[PDB]
Amino acid sequence: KQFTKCELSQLLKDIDGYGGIALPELICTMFHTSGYDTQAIVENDESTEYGLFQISNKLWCKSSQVPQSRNICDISCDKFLDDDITDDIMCAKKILDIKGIDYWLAHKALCTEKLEQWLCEKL
Residue 49, annotated ligand binder? Answer: yes
List the interface residues with Ca ion, window 43-82 (CB under 5 A): 79, 82
Interface of this chain with Ca ion, residues 81 to 100, rule: CB under 5 A: 82, 84, 87-88
Residue 16 engages Ca ion in binding (rule: CB under 5 A)? no
Cβ-proximal residues to 41 (8 Å cutoff; 6+ apart), any chain = 48, 49, 50, 51, 81
- Residue 42 CB, shortest distance to Ca ion, in Å, is 17
Going by the annotation, the residues of the binding site for Zn(2+) are 49, 116
Residues that bind Ca ion (CB under 5 A): 79, 82, 84, 87-88
